[PDB]
Paper text:
DNA methyltransferases DNMT3A- and DNMT3B-mediated DNA methylation critically regulate epigenomic and transcriptomic patterning during development. The hotspot DNMT3A mutations at the site of Arg822 (R882) promote polymerization, leading to aberrant DNA methylation that may contribute to the pathogenesis of acute myeloid leukemia (AML). Here, we report the crystal structures of the DNMT3A methyltransferase domain, revealing a molecular basis for its oligomerization behavior distinct to DNMT3B, and the enhanced intermolecular contacts caused by the R882H or R882C mutation. The fact that the RD interface mediates both DNMT3A/DNMT3B oligomerization and their substrate bindings highlights the essential role of the RD interface in DNMT3A/DNMT3B function.
Author numbering:
A (entry chain B): 626 to 832, 845 to 912
B (entry chain E): 628 to 667, 680 to 709, 728 to 780, 791 to 805, 893 to 912
C (entry chain A): 626 to 832, 847 to 912
D (entry chain F): 628 to 667, 680 to 709, 726 to 780, 791 to 807, 894 to 912
Amino acid sequence: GSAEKRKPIRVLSLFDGIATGLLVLKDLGIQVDRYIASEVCEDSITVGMVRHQGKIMYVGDVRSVTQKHIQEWGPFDLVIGGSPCNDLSIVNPARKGLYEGTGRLFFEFYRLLHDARPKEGDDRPFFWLFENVVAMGVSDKRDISRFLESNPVMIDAKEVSAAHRARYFWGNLPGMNRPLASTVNDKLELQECLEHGRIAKFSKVRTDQHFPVFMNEKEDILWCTEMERVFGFPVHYTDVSAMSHLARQRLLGRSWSVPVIRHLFAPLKEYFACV
Amino acid sequence: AEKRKPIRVLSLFDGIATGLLVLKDLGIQVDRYIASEVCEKIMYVGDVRSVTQKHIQEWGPFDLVIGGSPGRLFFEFYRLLHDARPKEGDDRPFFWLFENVVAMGVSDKRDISRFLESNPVMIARYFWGNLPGMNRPLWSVPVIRHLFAPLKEYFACV
Amino acid sequence: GSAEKRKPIRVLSLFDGIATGLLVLKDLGIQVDRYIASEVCEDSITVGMVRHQGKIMYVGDVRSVTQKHIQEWGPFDLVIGGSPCNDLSIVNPARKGLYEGTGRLFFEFYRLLHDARPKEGDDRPFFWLFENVVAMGVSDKRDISRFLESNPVMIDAKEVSAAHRARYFWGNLPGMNRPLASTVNDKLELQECLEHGRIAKFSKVRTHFPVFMNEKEDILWCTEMERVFGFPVHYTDVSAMSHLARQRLLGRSWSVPVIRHLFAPLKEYFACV
Amino acid sequence: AEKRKPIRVLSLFDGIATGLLVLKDLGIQVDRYIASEVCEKIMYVGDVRSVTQKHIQEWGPFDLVIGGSPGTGRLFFEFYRLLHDARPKEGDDRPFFWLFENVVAMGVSDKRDISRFLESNPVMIARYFWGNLPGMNRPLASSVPVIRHLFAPLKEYFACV
Ligand SMILES: Nc1ncnc2c1ncn2[C@@H]1O[C@H](CSCC[C@H](N)C(=O)O)[C@@H](O)[C@H]1O
Ligand SMILES: Nc1ncnc2c1ncn2[C@@H]1O[C@H](CSCC[C@H](N)C(=O)O)[C@@H](O)[C@H]1O
C-alpha cells in the first residue's frame, strides 16, 4: 500500500525452450530487467540467442544451478518453467513416472523455486508458473499439486488458437483461471495458419494416417511456418541454426502456446514497468 | 539457547520406530516423535501424501528429520525437510539423516548429494546428514546410534 | 517513334528455379502481365508458387514445350533462362559437355527463344537473357556464343554482394556491360549477412567454415545465404525442406542484385507501378 | 511458282559431296552446293564452327539441307542450327526440304530428342532417317541408294537435266 515507481521484471526461466516467456513478456510491453534461462538443447539456445539479441543469460543444465547461484543472481520476480514430459505422458508405455527418469527434473523446479521465493516477512510481489501435460498419471498430478501447494488450472490452446493443446498450469499468477479472451489476432482455424495455395482438412490440429493439408492434387503435412502460426509464434521464428525440418518440428512440439502464455502473463502489467 | 530441551523428531524412515529406539538407546529425552511412511506425544500419521506443510507447522517445531530405508522416498523426505527447516534467521539446532543402500544408481547418488548439499558416509549403506562427524568430502540400528551420538550434546538427556 | 501506353511485361522463364526473375521484376516496379515458368524441381516450384501467390503459370519440363505452345501462350516480351551447369563446369570431372548430359538443355532454350522471337518486320521490343557459369570449357563457351550470336558479359556478384559468383550473361538487354551501381541496399560484407552474435571469417563467401559463434566455428545458415545472394530473409523457408535442400536451391540461384542490374533498363519499355 | 529451277543444297553431312552424288544420280540440276563438316559455285567451307547466320544468308537461299553420318548430339545440333538459319521465313511458302541420317544404335533419349526437335518421327531402314520429304512422314513409334529412294520426290520440285 506504499508508492514506488514500477520496476522492470526479473525472470528465472527453467527449461526455457525457445524463450516463449521472454517473447510473451516483450509482446505485453513489460520491461525486462534480466532474463536468466536454464536450457540444454543447443538448437533452442541458438533460437533464443538470435531472436532476442543476446539478452538471455544462459546457465545450462538446471541441475548445475545451486541455491547460492539463485541468491547471487537474484532477486527474481518471476520464476517460470515447463519440465520435460516424456516420462509423465501416459502415451509412453516406457514412462518412468514423476520420480524417475526425466520426470524428477520437476523437483529441480521445486528446488530452485524454494531457493528463489522471498524470505518470510518480505511482501514484495513474486510469481511462479509450472506447466506440464494433462495426459499424465493421476498420481503424478496429485503429487505435483502436493509439492507445489496448488491445484492446477487446465487451459487448452484450442480456445485461442488452431491447436489441440490441453495443459496443466500450476502457479500463483493473478487470475489464472479467469476466462480467456478471444481477440482479433487469434487464428482460431487451421486454414488461417496455412501458406498460400493450401487448404485445411480440419479446423484444429492434433499432436496417424492424417496429412492435415491439401495442396493442389496431393496430400501434405504441416510446414514449420504454418506450425509457428498454429502455436502463435512469429513466422520464421524458428528459422535459425541450420536444423532439419524434423528438429524444428520437435522444438515447436515441446513449446508453449503463445496466446495461452500471453493470457497467463497479462496481469503482470499491473506489477512491473511497461514500455 | 537457555538450556537443553528434549528433542522433537519427524520420521519418514522405513520403520516407524527405528529412530525412537535409537534415541532412547542414547538416553535422549523426546518431547515429540511423529512417524510417516511412503506407501503407494508420539503418533503415527499414515501416508506421507496426507501430510501437508500446515501439518508440519502445527505439529512442529521439529529438531530432527530422518528418512530412508536399509528411490522416490528421497523426494518426500526432501519435501518434509524443506517444510520443517527453521526459517532464515533462526539459528536453533536442526539436524537430519537420510539412509539408503549403496547399490543405487550413480545418478541417484549424485542427485541426492546435490539436493542435500552433502556427500554421503559410506559404511553396505550410504548415510547423508549434517550431524558433526557426517561432514564428508568428495539391522541398521547401531550404526545410526553411532552417527546420532552428537545429538547428546544438543538436547536434554535423562 | 510512335506513341502508345506502356503495357505490362510478358515473361517466359525457363529453368526458373526459385523465381528470381519475377522477384526482381516486382522489385523494380515493373508491372508483370504474365509469367510462364518451366521448372521440374518441386521444391523450387513450391517456393515460387507460395512466394508469388499463384501468379506463376508452371508448365513443367522445358522439353514438353512446343512451338505451338509458345505461339498460343505468347506473345512474350522477355525470355530468360539459366540452364543446369553440372555438365558444363570444369570442376566436375564426369562432365558430359554442352552437347550431352544436362548440357544439351541449353539447346531447348535456343529452341524456344527462336520460337518466341518476333517475326520479321515486327519492331516490337523483345529481350532475352541466358546465364551460365564462367568455369566451363572454352569450346563450350565458344559454341554457346556461336548459337546465340552474342558474346557474353562477365558479371561477378562479389561487386554488389558478399558472394564470389562470376557468371556469363548472353543477351540483348540494354546496356548489360555498363558499370554496376553499388547502392545502399547492397551488403558487400559477409558480416552484414550474418545473424546476431556471429562473426565473419572472410569478407566474401566463396561457395570452409565461414563464421564464428561464441567459441565454435560454424557454417553459413540459409537465412544468411539468402542475405548473401540478395534474397529476402526466409524467402526459401517453405515446403519443409532439409537444410541441404535449401542450400541446393540457393546455390543454383541467380544473384538478386546482379539480375536487378541487368533488368533495370526494362523500366523504359514497360508499364511501371 | 513460275517454273522449276535447279536445286540449292547445304550439306553438313559426314561424308562430303554424298548429296551431290545422289542428286546427280537422280538427274537434278544443281545451282549451288555448300558443304561443311563438324570436325572437333560448289564449295567446301570447312569447320561448321566458322559458318554464321550471315554466311548462310549470303550463300543462300537454300532449298535442301542435309546432315548426319552413316556422342550423336553435336552433329545433330549443328545441323539443327543450320536448318534454322537456312529455313524460309514465315510467309515464304517456297519448297524447302531437309534430311538427317544417323545410326540406329543411339540412346533412346537421343532419338526422342531428335524427333522432338525436328517434329518428325524417324524412318527406319540399319539406320534412322528424319526428313520432311513426301514419304518420310511417319507415325509414332512403338551406301547411298537409300538416300536415292528418299530423295526421289525432289525431282518433282526442282529442275531436272
Ligand atoms: N537438465 C535440463 N536442464 C535444463 N533444461 C532441460 C534439461 N533437460 C531438458 N531440458 C529442456 O527442457 C525443455 C522442456 S520443453 C519446454 C519448452 C518451453 N516451455 C518453450 O515454450 O519453448 C526442453 O527444451 C529441454 O531441452
Ligand atoms: N528439364 C528441365 N526442364 C525445366 N527445368 C529444369 C530441367 N532440368 C533442370 N531444370 C531446372 O533448371 C534450374 C537450373 S539452376 C537456375 C535457377 C534459377 N536461375 C534461379 O535463380 O533460381 C534448376 O532449378 C533445375 O531444377
